[PDB]
C-alpha cells in the first residue's frame, strides 16, 4: 500500500482563482510562518541552567571506568583478563602475578581512556562485578597523558564513586 | 527444531535453483558453476570473459530485470593462483529477488568495466582498485577513491599491515605535515582465538 | 565548509556561479573499518556499525545482526524482534529530522532545526535508558538484544510519540508550502526512474521518482510483516517531492511506533541459546555450563559456519547491505559494507547537470549523505 | 595385504588388525572426543568421553579400547553418539568447581573446549558440590584437586614414562581422589610433563601460575640447548 | 590475442613495500604445531606464513611494548605448501620451508595391560 | 506550563492550534526515576527434561550450499527468479497528501 | 526542588563558595557534585 | 600500609618505586605520585575466619548475584584454614 | 605459451614508448609543479627526482608489470597536474625529516639489532 | 488517453499495441539469425510469442496491464526494446558455444 504526496489539482473556479491571487499578492503563508515564529516566540524555552541544572541519566548509563571493592577491602579483580580479551578497541593492559598471601591479584591494569569507546563490553564480560563504567562523565583534562588511568587511579575512582556505583547496580543488576 | 532455529523456505528454494539452471542453459559459454544456498541465496560463478554478457543479460532479459547493481566488492585470497574474487551483487525489482555473480582474477589481469551496463559501477570499481590493485579496463576515470594522495599499496589486501607502513605528524622545521616510518608506542596484540576442536563436521574437508 | 558536512571535498569547475561539473572527492573519513573487522570477533566487530552512519545507529546494527544471524541459522525471539522494529521506526524518526533540518539549514530555513533537536534530544534519552548510551548504544546484537525494556519505558515512548505529531505539523507549516522553500527546491535535481535504478539509488532516491519499491514491503524482515503503513511516492522526482516523501515517512514511523507499543509481547530478549547467545549472570555465577559458556563466549566467541551472505535492509538513508564472508571461526574472513550514500554521491554529478551553486547545496542536503557510512 | 574393510559415516577405510574405532576414524580426518585417552599411554576407558554408535548396534561402544571390526559402519555424528557425549559431559560438569576466571587452564582447557563443541550449554544440577583438599607433591606442579576429573593421565604417566609408581587413587565411588595418600614430592626430571596431560587445570605450572592467558601468547618454535638432545 | 610473456612472476614494484621489508624479511613456512596444553588437532590443518621477530621496548610512559617492524602481526594461512612457497617468491620474500610434521600410527591394545608374562601390565586403573 | 492566560490565547491564535493540549516540556506525566524492580521470564529451553541441545542447535543444521549445474561434473519451459511481482494498491487511509 | 517545574528544571544545586582549597565564588563546576547528591541531581534516582 | 622509599616516594601496593637514580622521577616534579591507600593484603588480612561445622562450606562473596561465581571449599585439614579463591575469606572448622 | 592476456603493449617495446610518453609528461610539468605548489627546490632537483623515481623501477622486465607502473604514474601526474596533491604530498618524495640510516654494517651494529 | 505513467522520464506512449507488436516482431525477426538449438533463441521465441498473443488477443489496454503482467505497459515497452537490444548483443556475443576454459583446481573451494 502507498500514497502520493504532490498529486493534487487546484479547483478553477472564479472563487479559488481569485484567493490565490489574493494569496500571491499580499503573502499570507508568509504571515502564517511569521505567525508560528510568533508562537514559539512566547513559549517557555527548553534551556536547562547548567551546571546548576543536569540533564537526566540512568543506571545504566556508561561513564569513567572505576575498580570495585569487596565490603571487606578486598579487590574484587582476579586478574582473569576476560575484559582484555573481549575489549573492542585493546584498550585494556594487564599484568598479574602471585600476591604475597598466594591470592590471583593485578599488578598492572592500565585502561587507555583514549583508546576507549565507553562500550560497555568490559563490565560485561566481567565474572565479578570487579570493572564498571561509573556515572561521571566530567573528568576532561588538559594533558593527553591524564587520560592514560592505570590502576592506582581506577582503584581510587571505585573508592571515590563506589556509594553511587553500588546503588546503581542495585537498580538495574535483575536485567543483567 | 522450533523456536531458536532459523526456519527453512524450499519454495524459494526450488524457485532459485530453477532459474540458476535456466540461466546456465543460456550462458554455457561463461557459466562455471551454479550455487543455492540454504538461506536461499543464489550464486553463479562466471569466466572472466563473461563479465560484460553475463551482466547485460541479466539486467535487460526480460524474464531476469536485474536493473538495480546493489554492490561489487572484491575478496583477496592469497592461497589461490587467482587473487581477487570479484563479486556482483544483483537486485530485481520486477521479480523481487537478487542474485550473486562471481569472477576471479589476479594482480596482472584486467577485468572489464561494467560502466557501460551499470552506471553505479564507476565508483565501485575505482575503490576495488584503490583497495586491492585490479586494473579495469575501459573505465571512463580509473583513480584513488579511498586512499591518501600518493598511498602506496592496496590496503584490503590480505599481505598489507593493518597499521600500514608510514605515519603522519607535524613538523616544525619544515612547517608541514610529513610521514616517517610507523612506530608504536603499544603494538597491536595478536590473539590466537582458534579452538583445537573442530566446530562443524558438516564442513569437513578430506584428510589429503 | 558548512555544507560540506566536514568532510567533503568537492572540487568543482564553475562557469560563473553555473556548476560545469562536479567532482567529489572521498576519504577524508576513511578510516579502514573493514580491514580493521577483521582482526575482531563478531561481537566485537559489532560496534562498529554504530559509527558507519552515525544518524542511524541502531538500523545498521539490525542489518549486521540479521547477517550474522542468518549465517548462524538462528532465530531472535519475538520479544527482540517487536523491540528491533520500534526501535528502528524511532532511529527512521531521529534520521529524518536530521536530513530535513540540516537541508533547511543548508538552504536556510534555520528554525525548526532547534525545533527538532529537541525532540532527538528526548530520543536520546530513550536510547540512555535503554542501553546506558546516547547515540552509539550497540543494543541490537546477532541473537537479540543486550538488555530488556526497563520499567516505565514504553508509557514515556507513547507520551512522546502522541506529542511527536504537533512538531511535523509546525514543520510543515514553516517550509511546505513557502513559496521561497518551494522556489528553492522545486524542480531541482530531477532524476528519472530508469536513470536512479541504473545508478544504484534507493530509499527516497528511488522513491521520488514514482518507483514502488520499499524493502520492509517487498523483502520484510523482523516482523515487519506485522505492521501496517503506507509508502509514499514521488511523481517530479525533484528535491520537494522528496522533501514531502521524508516528512510522510516520518508520520508512516509514527504510526509502526504506536502498532509496535500496542503490540509488545511477554518473554526473553535474546536467543535461548548460550553457545551463541550469554547466559544470565546469576546463571553464570551459578552453574558451570554457564560460566564456561561465558568465558568462552567472551574470550573467543562464538564459530560461525562457513558462508558468504547479502543481507540489506530499509535504512533511513536508503538500502544498507552487508557483504558478510564467513571462514568457519570466530572472526570474519571479509565484510563488505553497502551504503546508499555511496552510490548516492557518485549520481550527484548528473543530478547537478544545469543548475547553479545554490542548487548544488540543496542537491547535497537532498541526497542525505553521511560519510561514515560513504568512506567506512 | 592383512587390512580390513571398515566405514566411517559410510566411507570405506582400509585399516590394520587391532586398530581400534578413534584410530578409524582419526585416519578419515574426525577427532573423537576425549579425556582419559592419551597415544603415548595405555588404554584406561573410564571418562567415557569417546562412547559412539556402530551401525546396527543397540550399545553404544567406548572408541578408545575397541578394536573395530570388518564390516562395521560407525556413526560419529548419529543422534546416540550426540546425546552420549552430551550425558557425558553432564556428569563430568555436575561436581566441577566454577573456577574458570582462576584457573589457569582457562582459555586452553579440553573440558571448556569439547562443553562448547560436544556438551549442552545449561545446567540442570541443583545440588552442592563436592571439594576436596589440596595436596603437595612439589614446587614445580601446582595442585588444584578439586578441578580433577579422575582421567588418571597423570597416574599412568608416572607408571609408565616416568618409571616412578608414586601416584594413585584412593578410596571408591564420588569420594576417589588422586594423589599419594601421604606427604610425598614428585620430584622427576621428567615430571612437569603431568601438567601438559592434565586435560583440566587440577595440575599446573607453578612458576607459570597467574601471569598470562593462552590466547595473548606468541609462539616461537624453537630448540632447547639444556643438554645434547636438542 | 595473448602476448606469452616468459619470465617468472615478481610484483614487488606494485605491492608499495618498503625496500628494506622486502630484501631483509625472512618469512617462515610451516604447519603449526599442537598446542601441547590440548589433544585438539584443528589448528594443526594448514600452512602459515609469519615473518621474522624483530625488536620490541618498553615505553617509557607507561611501561608499555612498543614495536617498529609494520609485519610483526601479520600471519597468512594456505592451504598448501607450494601455494605459500609460490606467494613468497613472487612476493619476492626469502623463505624457510619446513615439512610437516604427522604423529605416527601407533598400536594400541587394551588387553596388553593385563599381560601374562610382559612388562606392559600396568599395576593400576 | 506557568504562562498567563492572555499570552496563551496570544499563542495560540499566533499558531492557530491549541498549545497547551500538547507541550514540548512534558512536565509530570513521565514515568517515576525509582520504579520496583522486575522478574524477567526465562526462554523456552529452560526446562529439566525433553531438552538435549542437539535438538535445538540450529548452527550445526547449516550446511554448504546446494551445487546446480557444475560444469566438471521437450517442453521445457522458461522459468523467472521469482514469480512477478503484484502491482501495489492504494492506501485506503489517505490515498492523497 | 520544584515539582512544577518541567523535566530538567525541577531540581538544581546551589555551589557552595568554598571547597576543599580553592574559593568558588565564581569557578564552579559540575565536578564539585558528591557521588550520592550527583546521584540524586542527575535524576537516576528519585530519593534524596 | 603504604611505605616510603629511602627516596620518599610512596610505594604502591605492587611495590613499584622509581630508583633514586631513575630519571623517570621527574614526571611527579611540581605534581604527585597517584598512590590508593587501601591496600586489599592488609584488609583481607583484618577479617576474622568463619568457624563452621561442616566439612564443606559455600562462598559466593556475599550479596548474592552481586558477589562472585558461588565455590565450595573444603575444610579437613586442621592445619591450615580454607580460602576463598575469588574473596579471600578464611573458614575453619572447630578446634581445640 | 603461458597464456596471458596484455593490459596494454604486447611485449617490452611498447611498454618501453609507454614509459618515454610518460617520463616527457613528468619532465614537462616540473616547472609548473615548482611553480604553482611554490617549492623551495629547483627544477632541476625536481627532474633528478622524477629520473630517480623512473629508474627505482629500471629492473622490470615483465611488460605487464611496466604498463601497471606507467598506469600508476599516470595517476600521480593527474593528481600533481589538478593540484589534488598539497605541498606535503610532493615534498613527501624528499624524505626531508627522516636522519640519514647509515649502511655499513659496524653503524647497524653499534645502533640496534636490524640487519 | 492515460495522464501520466507516475514514473519520471517514462512518457506516455499513444497505440501501445502497434509499438509492442513491432518491437516483438522485430524481436523474433532478430532471434530468427540465432541457431536452432540455442537455449537463448527458444526461451526468448517462446515468452515472445506468449506476449505477442497477449497483445493480438486483448483490444482494452488496463485488462492487457493486467494479464502480461509487466507494470503498466509502457514499461512493457520499454522492456521490449531492451530484449531487442540484447538479441542483438547476444547475436555478437554467440554464448550458446562450449565454455571457454576451467578454473583452476582450486579456484572455487570455500572454506579456503
Ligand atoms: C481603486 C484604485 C486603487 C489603485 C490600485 C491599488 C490596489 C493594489 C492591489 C495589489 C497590491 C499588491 C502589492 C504587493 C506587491 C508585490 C506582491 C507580489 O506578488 O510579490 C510576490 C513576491 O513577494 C514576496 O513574496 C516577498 C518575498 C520576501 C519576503 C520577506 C518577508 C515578507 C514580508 C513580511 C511582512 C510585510 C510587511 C511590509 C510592510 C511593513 C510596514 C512598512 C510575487 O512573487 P511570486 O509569488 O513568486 O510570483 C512571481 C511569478 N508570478
Ligand atoms: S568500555 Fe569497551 S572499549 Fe572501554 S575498556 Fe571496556 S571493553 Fe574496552
Ligand atoms: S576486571 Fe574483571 S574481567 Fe577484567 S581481569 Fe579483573 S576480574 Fe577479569
Ligand atoms: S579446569 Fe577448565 S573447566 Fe575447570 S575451572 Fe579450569 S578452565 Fe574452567
Ligand atoms: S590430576 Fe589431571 S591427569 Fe590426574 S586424574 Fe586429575 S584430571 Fe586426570
Ligand atoms: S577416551 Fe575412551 S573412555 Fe576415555
Ligand atoms: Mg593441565
Ligand atoms: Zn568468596
Given at each position: 500500500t502507498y500514497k502520493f504526496v504532490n498529486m493534487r489539482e487546484p479547483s478553477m473556479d472564479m472563487k479559488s482563482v481569485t484567493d490565490r491571487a489574493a494569496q500571491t499578492l499580499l503573502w499570507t503563508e508568509l504571515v502564517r510562518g511569521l505567525g508560528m515564529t510568533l508562537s514559539y516566540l512566547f513559549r517557555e524555552p527548553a534551556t536547562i541552567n547548567y551546571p546548576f541544572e543536569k540533564g537526566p541519566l540512568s543506571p545504566r548509563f556508561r561513564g569513567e571506568h572505576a575498580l570495585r571493592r569487596y565490603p571487606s577491602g578486598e579487590e574484587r579483580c582476579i586478574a582473569c583478563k576476560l575484559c582484555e580479551a573481549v575489549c573492542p578497541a585493546q584498550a585494556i593492559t594487564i599484568e598479574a602475578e602471585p600476591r604475597a598471601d598466594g591470592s590471583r591479584r593485578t599488578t598492572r591494569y592500565d585502561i587507555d581512556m583514549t583508546k576507549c569507546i565507553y562500550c560497555g563490553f568490559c563490565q560485561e564480560a566481567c565474572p565479578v562485578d570487579a570493572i564498571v563504567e561509573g556515572p561521571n562523565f566530567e573528568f576532561s583534562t588538559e594533558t593527553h597523558e591524564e587520560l592514560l588511568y592505570n590502576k592506582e587511579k581506577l582503584l581510587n575512582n571505585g573508592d571515590k564513586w563506589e556509594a553511587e556505583i553500588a546503588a546503581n547496580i542495585q537498580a538495574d543488576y535483575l536485567y543483567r | 527444531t522450533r523456536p531458536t532455529i532459523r526456519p527453512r523456505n524450499d519454495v524459494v528454494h526450488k524457485q532459485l535453483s530453477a532459474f540458476g539452471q535456466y540461466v546456465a542453459e543460456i550462458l554455457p559459454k561463461y557459466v562455471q558453476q551454479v550455487q543455492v544456498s540454504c538461506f536461499n541465496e543464489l550464486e553463479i560463478f562466471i569466466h572472466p570473459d563473461g563479465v560484460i554478457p553475463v551482466l547485460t543479460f541479466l539486467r535487460d532479459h526480460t524474464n531476469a530485470q536485474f536493473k538495480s547493481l546493489a554492490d561489487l566488492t572484491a575478496v583477496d585470497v592469497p592461497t589461490r593462483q587467482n587473487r581477487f574474487e570479484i563479486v556482483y551483487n544483483l537486485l530485481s525489482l520486477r521479480f523481487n529477488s537478487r542474485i550473486r555473480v562471481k569472477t576471479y582474477t589476479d594482480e596482472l589481469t584486467p577485468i572489464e568495466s561494467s560502466v557501460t551496463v551499470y552506471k553505479a559501477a564507476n565508483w565501485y570499481e575505482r575503490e576495488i582498485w584503490d583497495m586491492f590493485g585490479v586494473f579495469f579496463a575501459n573505465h571512463p576515470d580509473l583513480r584513488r577513491i579511498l586512499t591518501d594522495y600518493g598511498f602506496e599499496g592496496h590496503p584490503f589486501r590480505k599481505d598489507f599491515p593493518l597499521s600500514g607502513y608510514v605515519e603522519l605528524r607535524y613538523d616544525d622545521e619544515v612547517k608541514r605535515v610529513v610521514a616517517e616510518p610507523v612506530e608504536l608506542a603499544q603494538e597491536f596484540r595478536k590473539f590466537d582465538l582458534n579452538s583445537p576442536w573442530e566446530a562443524f563436521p558438516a564442513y569437513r574437508q578430506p584428510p589429503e | 565548509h558548512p555544507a560540506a558536512h566536514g568532510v567533503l571535498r568537492l572540487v568543482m569547475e564553475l562557469s560563473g556561479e553555473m556548476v560545469r561539473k562536479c567532482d567529489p572527492h572521498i576519504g577524508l573519513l576513511h578510516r579502514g573499518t573493514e580491514k580493521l573487522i577483521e582482526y575482531k570477533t563478531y561481537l566485537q566487530a559489532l560496534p562498529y556499525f554504530d559509527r558507519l552512519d552515525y544518524v542511524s545507529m541502531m538500523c545498521n546494527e539490525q542489518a549486521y545482526s540479521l547477517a550474522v544471524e542468518k549465517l548462524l541459522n538462528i532465530q531472535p525471539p519475538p520479544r527482540a524482534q517487536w523491540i528491533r522494529v520500534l526501535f528502528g521506526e524511532i532511529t527512521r524518526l531521529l534520521n529524518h529530522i536530521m536530513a530535513v533540518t540540516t537541508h533547511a539549514l543548508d538552504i536556510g530555513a534555520m528554525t525548526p532545526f532547534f525545533w527538532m533537536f529537541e525532540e532527538r534530544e528526548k530520543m536520546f534519552e530513550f536510547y540512555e535508558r535503554v542501553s546506558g548510551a546516547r547515540m552509539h548504544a550497540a543494543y541490537i546484537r546477532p541473537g537479540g538484544v543486550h538488555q530488556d525494556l526497563p520499567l516505565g519505558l514504553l508509557d514515556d515512548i507513547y507520551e512522546f510519540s502522541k506529542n511527536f505529531s504537533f512538531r511535523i505539523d509546525e514543520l510543515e507549516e514553516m517550509l511546505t508550502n513557502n513559496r521561497i522553500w518551494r522556489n528553492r527546491t522545486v524542480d531541482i535535481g530531477v532524476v528519472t526512474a530508469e536513470d536512479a535504478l541504473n545508478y544504484g539509488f534507493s530509499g527516497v532516491m528511488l522513491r521520488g521518482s514514482g518507483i514502488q519499491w520499499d524493502l520492509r514491503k517487498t523483502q520484510p524482515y523482523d516482523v515487519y510483516d506485522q505492521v501496517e503503513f503506507d509508502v509514499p511516492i514521488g511523481s517530479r522526482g525533484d528535491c520537494y517531492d522528496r522533501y514531502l516523501c521524508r516528512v510522510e515517512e516520518m508520520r508512516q514511523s509514527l504510526r509502526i511506533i504506536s502498532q509496535c507499543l500496542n503490540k509488545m509481547p511477554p518473554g526473553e530478549?535474546?536467543?535461548?541459546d548460550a553457545k551463541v547467545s550469554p547466559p544470565k549472570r546469576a546463571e553464570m555465577k551459578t552453574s558451570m555450563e554457564s560460566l564456561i559458556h561465558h568465558f568462552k563466549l567472551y574470550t573467543e566467541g562464538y564459530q560461525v559456519p562457513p558462508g558468504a551472505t547479502y543481507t540489506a535492509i530499509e535504512a533511513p538513508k536508503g538500502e544498507f547491505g552487508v557483504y558478510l564472508v564467513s571462514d568457519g571461526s570466530s572472526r570474519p574472513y571479509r565484510c563488505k559494507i553497502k551504503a546508499p550514500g555511496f552510490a548516492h554521491l557518485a549520481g550527484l554529478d548528473k543530478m547537478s547537470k544545469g543548475h547553479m551553486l545554490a542548487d548544488v547545496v540543496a542537491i547535497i542536503g537532498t541526497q542525505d549523505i553521511v560519510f561514515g557510512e560513504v568512506d567506512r | 595385504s592383512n587390512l580390513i574393510e571398515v566405514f566411517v559415516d559410510g566411507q570405506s577405510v582400509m585399516v590394520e588388525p587391532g586398530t581400534t574405532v578413534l584410530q578409524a576414524c582419526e585416519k578419515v580426518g574426525m577427532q573423537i572426543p576425549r579425556f582419559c585417552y592419551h597415544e603415548r599411554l595405555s588404554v584406561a576407558g573410564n571418562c567415557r568421553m569417546c562412547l559412539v554408535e556402530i551401525e546396527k548396534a543397540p550399545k553404544v561402544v567406548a572408541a578408545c579400547a575397541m578394536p573395530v571390526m570388518k564390516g562395521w559402519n560407525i556413526l560419529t555424528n548419529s543422534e546416540k553418539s550426540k546425546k552420549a557425549r552430551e550425558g557425558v559431559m553432564e556428569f563430568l560438569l555436575?561436581?566441577?568447581?566454577?573456577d574458570c576466571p582462576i584457573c589457569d587452564q582457562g582459555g586452553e582447557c579440553d573440558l571448556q573446549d569439547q562443553s562448547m563443541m560436544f556438551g549442552s550449554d545449561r545446567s540442570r544440577f541443583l545440588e552442592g558440590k563436592r571439594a576436596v583438599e589440596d595436596k603437595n607433591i612439589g614446587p614445580l606442579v601446582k595442585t588444584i584437586m578439586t578441578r580433577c576429573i579422575q582421567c588418571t593421565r597423570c597416574i599412568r604417566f608416572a607408571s609408565e614414562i616416568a618409571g616412578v609408581d608414586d601416584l594413585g587413587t584412593t578410596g571408591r565411588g564420588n569420594d576417589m581422589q588422586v594423589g599419594t595418600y601421604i606427604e610425598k614430592m614428585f620430584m622427576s626430571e621428567l615430571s612437569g610433563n603431568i601438567i601438559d596431560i592434565?586435560?583440566?587445570?587440577?595440575?599446573?605450572s607453578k612458576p607459570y601460575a597467574f601471569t598470562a592467558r593462552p590466547w595473548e601468547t606468541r609462539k616461537t618454535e624453537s630448540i632447547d640447548v639444556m643438554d645434547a638432545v636438542g | 590475442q595473448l602476448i606469452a610473456v616468459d619470465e617468472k612472476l615478481d610484483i614487488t614494484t606494485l605491492t608499495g613495500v618498503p625496500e628494506e621489508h622486502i630484501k631483509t624479511r625472512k618469512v617462515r613456512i610451516f604447519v603449526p604445531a599442537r598446542n601441547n596444553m590440548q589433544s585438539g588437532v584443528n589448528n594443526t590443518k594448514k600452512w602459515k606464513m609469519e615473518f621474522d621477530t624483530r625488536e620490541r621496548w618498553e615505553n617509557p610512559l607507561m611501561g608499555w611494548s612498543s614495536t617498529?617492524?609494520?609485519?610483526?602481526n601479520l600471519v597468512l594461512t594456505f592451504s598448501t605448501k607450494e601455494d605459500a612457497v609460490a606467494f613468497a617468491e613472487k612476493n619476492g620474500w626469502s623463505f624457510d620451508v619446513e615439512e610437516r610434521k604427522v604423529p605416527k600410527p601407533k598400536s594400541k591394545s587394551y588387553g596388553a595391560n593385563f599381560s601374562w608374562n610382559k612388562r606392559t601390565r600396568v599395576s593400576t586403573k | 506550563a506557568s504562562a498567563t492566560r492572555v499570552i496563551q490565547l496570544l499563542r495560540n491564535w499566533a499558531s492557530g492550534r491549541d498549545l497547551q493540549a500538547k507541550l514540548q516540556l512534558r512536565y509530570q506525566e513521565i514515568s517515576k526515576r525509582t520504579q520496583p524492580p522486575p522478574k524477567l521470564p526465562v526462554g523456552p529451553?529452560?526446562?529439566?527434561?525433553?531438552?538435549?541441545?542437539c535438538t535445538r542447535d540450529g548452527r550445526r543444521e547449516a550446511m554448504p550450499p546446494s551445487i546446480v549445474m557444475s560444469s566438471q561434473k521437450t517442453e521445457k519451459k522458461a522459468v523467472t527468479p521469482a514469480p512477478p511481482i503484484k502491482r501495489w494498491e492504494l492506501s485506503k487511509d489517505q490515498p492523497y497528501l | 526542588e520544584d515539582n512544577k517545574q518541567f523535566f530538567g528544571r525541577h531540581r538544581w544545586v546551589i555551589y557552595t563558595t568554598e571547597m576543599n582549597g580553592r574559593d568558588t565564588f565564581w569557578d564552579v563546576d559540575g565536578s564539585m557534585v558528591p557521588p550520592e547528591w550527583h546521584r540524586w541531581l542527575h535524576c537516576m534516582t528519585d530519593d534524596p | 600500609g603504604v611505605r616510603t622509599s629511602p627516596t620518599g616516594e610512596k610505594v604502591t601496593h605492587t611495590g613499584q618505586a622509581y630508583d633514586d637514580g631513575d630519571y623517570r622521577r621527574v614526571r611527579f616534579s611540581d605534581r604527585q605520585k597517584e598512590v590508593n591507600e587501601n591496600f586489599a593484603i592488609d584488609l583481607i588480612a583484618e577479617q576474622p575466619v568463619s568457624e563452621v561445622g561442616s566439612r564443606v562450606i559455600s562462598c559466593d562473596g556475599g550479596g548474592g548475584a552481586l558477589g562472585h561465581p558461588r565455590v565450595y571449599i573444603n575444610?579437613?585439614?586442621?592445619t591450615k584454614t580454607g580460602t576463598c579463591g575469588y574473596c579471600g575469606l578464611q573458614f575453619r572448622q572447630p578446634h581445640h | 605459451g603461458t597464456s596471458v592476456k596484455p593490459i596494454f603493449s604486447r611485449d617490452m617495446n611498447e611498454a618501453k614508448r609507454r614509459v618515454r610518453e610518460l617520463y616527457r609528461a613528468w619532465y614537462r610539468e616540473v616547472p609548473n609543479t615548482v611553480h604553482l605548489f611554490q617549492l623551495d627546490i629547483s627544477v632541476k632537483q625536481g627532474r633528478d627526482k622524477v629520473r630517480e623515481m623512473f629508474m627505482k623501477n629500471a629492473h622490470v622486465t615483465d611488460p605487464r608489470v611496466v604498463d601497471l607502473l606507467v598506469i600508476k604514474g599516470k595517476m600521480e601526474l593527474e593528481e600533481t597536474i589538478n593540484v589534488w596533491k598539497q605541498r606535503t604530498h610532493i615534498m613527501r618524495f624528499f624524505h626531508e625529516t627522516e636522519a640519514p640510516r647509515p649502511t655499513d654494517f659496524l653503524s647497524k651494529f653499534y645502533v640496534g639489532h636490524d640487519p | 488517453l492515460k495522464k501520466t505513467t507516475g514514473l519520471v522520464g517514462l512518457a506516455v506512449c499513444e497505440t501501445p499495441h502497434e509499438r509492442l507488436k513491432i518491437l516483438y516482431t522485430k524481436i523474433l525477426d532478430v532471434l530468427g539469425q540465432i541457431p536452432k538449438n540455442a537455449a537463448y533463441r527458444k526461451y526468448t521465441e517462446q515468452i515472445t510469442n506468449e506476449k505477442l498473443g497477449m497483445v493480438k488477443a486483448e483490444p482494452d489496454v488496463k485488462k492487457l496491464e493486467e494479464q502480461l503482467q509487466g507494470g503498466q505497459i509502457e514499461e512493457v515497452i520499454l522492456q521490449a526494446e531492451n530484449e531487442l537490444s540484447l538479441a542483438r548483443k547476444m547475436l555478437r556475443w554467440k554464448p550458446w558455444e562450449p565454455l571457454v576454459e576451467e578454473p583452476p583446481a582450486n579456484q572455487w573451494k570455500w572454506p579456503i
Open positions: - | - | 530478549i535474546k536467543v535461548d | 555436575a561436581n566441577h568447581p566454577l592434565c586435560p583440566v587445570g587440577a595440575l599446573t | 617498529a617492524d609494520p609485519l610483526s | 529451553s529452560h526446562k529439566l527434561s525433553n531438552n538435549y541441545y | - | 575444610l579437613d585439614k586442621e | - | -
